[PDB]
Amino acid sequence: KVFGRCELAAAMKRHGLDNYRGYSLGNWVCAAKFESNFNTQATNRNTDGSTDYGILQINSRWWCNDGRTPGSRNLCNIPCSALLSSDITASVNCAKKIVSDGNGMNAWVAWRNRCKGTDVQAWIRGCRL
Ligand code: NA
């Protein structure tokens, strides 16, 4: 599913992401836009052989099991395919684990490079929330 901007903001809010560990909703929407262009089916392979899955591009080296990333962990305890669902619950629940891991949202390279230190509230302007 390809979300609309406000539709995704609402979904994320309902799933407890607004101000989760101090990151306002616009941060999460901004990261999703640049990670996946709001497409839950997004996948991208990394140089190390791991793959990133879903709306928030969660990596198989640490966070999910895809059956093809040798020596990897599955810290969210989920098949990576669950991250591709139109239902964002598994992505959100795993993202909450990731953002709590030490480095905050810096874990998402696109957040650091394209969202951090920008007016992220712009991503939710106009939405009914
Ligand atoms: Na893995």
UniProtKB/Swiss-Prot annotation:
Disulfide bonds join 6-127, 30-115, 64-80, 76-94. Its main location: secreted. It comes from the Eukaryota. One of its GO terms (molecular function) is identical protein binding. InterPro entries: Glyco_hydro_22, Glyco_hydro_22_CS, Glyco_hydro_22_lys, Lysozyme-like_dom_sf. The keyword Oxidoreductase does not apply. In the egg white and polymorphonuclear leukocytes. One of its GO terms (biological process) is defense response to Gram-negative bacterium. It holds the Pfam family Lys. SUPFAM superfamilies: Lysozyme-like (SSF53955). Keywords: Allergen, Antimicrobial, Bacteriolytic enzyme, Disulfide bond, Glycosidase, Hydrolase, Secreted, Signal. Residues 1-129 form the C-type lysozyme domain. Lysozymes have primarily a bacteriolytic function; those in tissues and body fluids are associated with the monocyte-macrophage system and enhance the activity of immunoagents. Has bacteriolytic activity against M.luteus. This is Lysozyme C. The lineage of its organism: Eukaryota, Metazoa, Chordata, Craniata, Vertebrata.
